[model samples]
Target: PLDPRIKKLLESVPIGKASVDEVRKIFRQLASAAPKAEVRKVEDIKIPGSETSINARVYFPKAKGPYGVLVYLHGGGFVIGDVESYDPLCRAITNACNCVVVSVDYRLAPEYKFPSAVIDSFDATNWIYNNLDKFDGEMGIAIAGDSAGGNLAAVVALLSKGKLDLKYQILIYPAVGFDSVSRSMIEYSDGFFLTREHIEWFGSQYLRSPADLLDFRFSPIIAQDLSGLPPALIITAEYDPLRDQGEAYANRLLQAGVPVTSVRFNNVIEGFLSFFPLIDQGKDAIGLIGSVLRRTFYDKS
Candidate 1:
């Protein structure tokens, strides 16, 4: 059975049936009401890009941080979420890890299409790598995100791997494949908060062509190899439709000789990560990321 609290919350406000604008408004309102954490510092930045510069927000526990850096991407099926959409979590993450967190505001789709988020993410990672000093940080870098953002992080890790060294990665119930696998996707198809319909809607908002579905960048799980990638912590919610594929992605990373820790959050459904204010498990997950980040980015200091 699902956790009673989350189940009630899920039943209270049904999603997955609205137009893009309606759903986007729902998320934005929640994000605004989302509880805040007192990070030591927060700064708005503009990252240089090809066609235009992208916006980002940096959260830190202190003013000067040679601290490990984490680049975060927000989840909204590649079309909706923004840096503000994930502000509260970023603040909590920064406080927990005592590190600098740079939340990327990659352009959404319909307007940008496939590979725009990918290209922007990689560009931001590279820019951060070259300007570590400005962040009061070191060269140590880790990328993290949920859903579509998780897809972006995994792709960036692969595309930038063997190039810019990454300390670690955190993937929260990531959207790992375009093709739906059986059981998890089928059994958990509806009444689980995120429906098959919602997934399809999200994809339509972002993907422009037929072939884009199979692109390895879109489904990093099908990427040729995952060898030599940084250590990864892939979080999966047992009741989520994308659960199996995300775990499969972790298994591939392990098989490819990349160190991985696959964690399954039982009973809870998707989008639990952002429910930190009301969910103890959500708070715990952030704590887990923070603890793991410290181990990877810093010593026992």
Candidate 2:
């Protein structure tokens, strides 16, 4: 069942009704409305990327030092989203999980094209792994993101298997695959906050060619080897079009002998995590990520 409160809100979303710029304007408007949590500090930093230095925002917890580091990627279908766009959520995560969050402002699509965001995120993660001491990130590091950002987190986790020691992966409503004919994809394609047209538009904007669909960077669920990746916390929303694919990725991880904690928040739509201030389940989901991260890094701390 869809949450009654969000029903009206969903109607206002211009998923199939507006242009990309209009949608981005509304997204930013809504993001600004969400209450921003106060972390001890928020600093803008530059991370060395494959082509150029990407911008990043680091959030420090108020409580103490030696906190776990979380490399957070924002969810805007790889087309929209910046460090400031995810500032509130990252700040909340930092305080909720007692960690230092490095939110990457990777280049967006259409402008940078396919694999650019992936390479930048991977580069930022690697740089963070090597330079953890600089951010008081002595408690080890983890990778996390929501929606398209979640896809990057999963890919980075897979790509960094042996190289960087990631403590965990926190994926929220991740678009793990390009399967558009799945049950949830068809069932909730319309009326849901994330529509089929929105998905296709995002794909067209982010991917240069259809061949990119087969690339694991665009579809981590299709990645050949999911084994030996960091343990995962995959959060899915019941009404999200990407719900099934996210769960499918979790199942794949489990089959590959990787630890996974998959949770589906019922009656919620995709991108609900950003509405945590208004949505109760969204708050719970964020807290779950924090709990999982704390437990995963318990031994190190």
Candidate 3:
């Protein structure tokens, strides 16, 4: 069952029932209502994108001194989300993880199409790697994202294996596969915040053609080899359609000798992380992420 608070919150608002523009507008409105968290500083900057420059927001921890960096990507099925909409979440991440957070506003789809986001995300990560001096002090760097952004984070981790030296990866209810056979997809395909039709709609708008579905950059779970990637902390929701695929990615990462900490937040639906201010479970997940980051970067267990 969905959390009672979230269930009640969704009562009047239509869930998963709108066109692209309407849904995008709704998300923008909801984002403004999100509660803010205090951080040391927040700066808006530009980074290299595929064709031109892209916007990015940096959130510094409240405490001073050296801090590990997390290059974050926002989740909106690679379409609707932007840095402004995700401002509060990024602020919460900086405070919780006690690390510098760089939220990349990578190019979206339909306008940019397939591979545009991938290119922009990789470019941003690479730029961050080269320009670590911009922060207080460079402890280390990691990658993290939610939903479609999770897919980009995993792909970026794999792409940066030998080049960028990423310390860890954090995937939150990631859409790592397009598996029609996954049982979770069939069971909780509706009324779960993220539905099957939502996935299809997102894919259709984001992917250029049917062939893009098979591309490893879009579907990290189908990647030929998952070996030699950074250590990962993958969070899944019990009622999310992407649960099975996310867990499967964890299993594959384990099989490939990558260290993984997989946890399923029972009874929660997708996008719960974005509701940290309203949901206790979201706070719990953020706490877990902070602990994992401390262990991975600071080497304090």
Candidate 4:
């Protein structure tokens, strides 16, 4: 059972039923309702070499000269989520980890098919890298996201490896595979907030043709090479449909000789990052994530 507060929050927002536009509207409303925090600024920015620009919100702490940058991708199964929907979690990350967070609002799907979001994510990442100094870029750059965004972050880290100078990846319940063959896909495909049906719907919305499903960019678990990638912190919920695929990707990276830390959050369902604001377990999960980030980046320095 969910906490009463989380239940109320869940009731307040329509999940799978609402259209993408309507969900974006709801996200704006919820973002407006979020508690105001100090030392944060939100804005929409344009990325070069893209038809459409990205929406980004930057969060900073009290530190002065420079800070590490964490580029966050919002989850909506490649269709819905935006910067506003992820406001609470972004705020929590910036506040807790004491780093500058730039949440990217990548283009959604159906209208913008397979390579579109990928291009947007890469462009946003490159933009952050080129302009990091303006935002007081300090320690190093890290990429992160949840669900579909996690998939984007993972792909971004892989794509940007050696090409760009990213230091780490923070993936939360990443959807790294499209095929519904994993054990968790069969076991927890229903009842949880995310389902196989929901993923199929999202796939149909995001992919122009079924062939796109086999593309490595769409299904990263099928990538030919996972070597030479930056270190990663992969966080997966026990009951998520993508659990097995995420674990498999982590293992693949490990096998490829990439340093990886996989943490499975037991007794939790999907969308914990979104619901963490209303649930104590969610906060605990975020704390664990913070610890992972600190251990991976801070302690190493």
Candidate 5:
């Protein structure tokens, strides 16, 4: 069952009627309303070679040294979303996972278009690698995100290959393809919070040229080879339109000899990660994620 707080939040926000900027504003408002924690430091760092600067929020738990670092991306269908919109969730991840999270405010699309966001993400990962030592970088680094951000996380792993050593990827209901013929797309096309119309609209806004859809940088699942990528913790919501594609991509990664752990949040709606703190299932999901992060980062046995 959907948590009542989440239901109330969904009802309170006029999601469909709001413009992208308005939605971002509302998300920031909601995030600010969450219980306050004294953030160690929030810095606006410029990622080199990027046209616009990206923000990196560093949250420290008990002033520990050399903590595991997780690079987090926010979901906005590649069109909308900013660092402020995902602040609360990133804070939760930092606190729960016992790691320092570097949230990337990558460039969005329509204005930037396909490959722009991808390039920004790739650049952000490289920046994190080179500067990890400054943020106490003794532990391994992991990449994670939800929805379109999840797709970016997966693509980064594939793009980095052996060039960058990524410990693992945490994908949450990632949009892995533009193909609408898939069964999950047809089955959950309507009535859900995320609709086929919305997805098509997002795609249209994110891709400048139709041919860009063929690029692996935009659709990582379509890439011919997925071998030698980092291990994955792929999470899919049962009722999500992108569920099938997320599963298909996970299976493809596993088949390509990559380590993969896939889980479906049964009876849960999509976009749970954004409103996670308010939902029981969201807490459960995070707890599971924490366990996975611990095993991946701390278990040397």
Candidate 6:
């Protein structure tokens, strides 16, 4: 069953019915009531990149010195959403995890296209990592994101993960495949907030062609080398269309020799992780994420 909050959320979004632009506007507006957590500091800067520098909002949690750094990517099906749209989730994670959160505002789709968002995300990660000290995160760095952002995080981890320094990855209800062929894809595809047609629409907007669908950067589950990637905590919403694929990605990571923890939240649907005001599960999810982060990078403290 959908969380009552999420049932309200689903009825509100145009989902498969609207144009990408229209649905985006509706998506952000429907999320307007999200609760924002207060963090110690918020800095908006254009982080440097090879192809282009992207704007990133940095959030500092309550504690002062040298905390871990977390790079957060927002979910908008690669089309909508900006840093502002993700403020609540970022702030909550920042405060709960005692880390410096850098939320990357990567270029959107139908404009930048595939590899653009991925490249921007990679560059932003490098910028945050190189200047972690400035954000007071000397302990270590991690990458995390939801939906399309999770795809970015996993792609980045596969492409660049080579050290123990990149401590962890937290993937929230990630979209991983075309059919995915999972039961949820059909079972929840109709009335869920994330509909099958919308998923296809998102694909059309972000991908250049059907060929790009197989690219490891776009589909990290098929990535050739997932070894040496950071330990991952993959969270899937039981009712999410993407649930099985997200969990599949976790199993893939484990098979490739990366440590993995997969949890399926049974009561919620997609988008609940970021919508605390609507879904109470958001609070518990944030705390579980924080606890995992503390265990990974700050156990001594």
> What is each predicted model's overall lDDT from 0 to 1?
0.85, 0.87, 0.87, 0.78, 0.79, 0.84
lDDT of 1 by residue, 190-251 (tens): 88877788788778878888788889889898889889998999999989888888898999
- State the local distance difference test value for candidate 6: 0.84
lDDT at 95, model 6: 80
What value does the lDDT take at residue 223 in candidate 2? 80
Model 5 residue runs over 4 Å out of place are 1-18, 30-32, 36-41
Off by more than 4 A, model 6? 8-12
Task: Output candidate 1 Cα RMSD.
Answer: 1.6
Sort by lDDT, best first.
2, 3, 1, 6, 5, 4
Better of 1 and 4 by lDDT: 1
| TM values, all candidates | 0.96, 0.96, 0.96, 0.89, 0.91, 0.94
lDDT of 5 by residue, 1-301 (tens): 5445545665663345677777667767865565544556656666774655655565554446567778888888887777777777777777677677888888887678888888888888888887888778668788998998998998888888877898889998898867768887898887667888878778988888789788888789999899888889999988789999999999999999999999998866677867675667876787777777767776622
* Per-candidate count of clashing residue pairs (backbone under 3 Å): 2, 0, 0, 0, 0, 0
Write candidate 3's Cα lDDT for 222-294 as tens digits: 8878898999999999989999999999999999999999999997888898888788899899889999987
State the displacement of the C-alpha of residue 224, model 5, in Å, after optimal TM-score superposition: 1.6
Per-residue lDDT tens digits of candidate 4, residues 210-283? Answer: 88888877888788888888888898888788998899999999999989989887767778766664556777
Which regions of candidate 3 deviate over 4 angstroms? 13-19
Query: Looking at candidate 2, what is the lDDT of residue 34?
Result: 78
Q: Which portions of model 2 show Cα errors greater than 4 Å?
A: 12-19, 299-301
For candidate 6, give the lDDT of residue 30: 60
RMSD of each: 1.6, 1.6, 1.6, 2.8, 2.4, 1.8
Task: Give candidate 4 regions above 4 Å deviation.
Answer: 1-18, 26-37, 40-44, 295-301
Cα shift from native, residue 225, model 2 (Å): 1.4
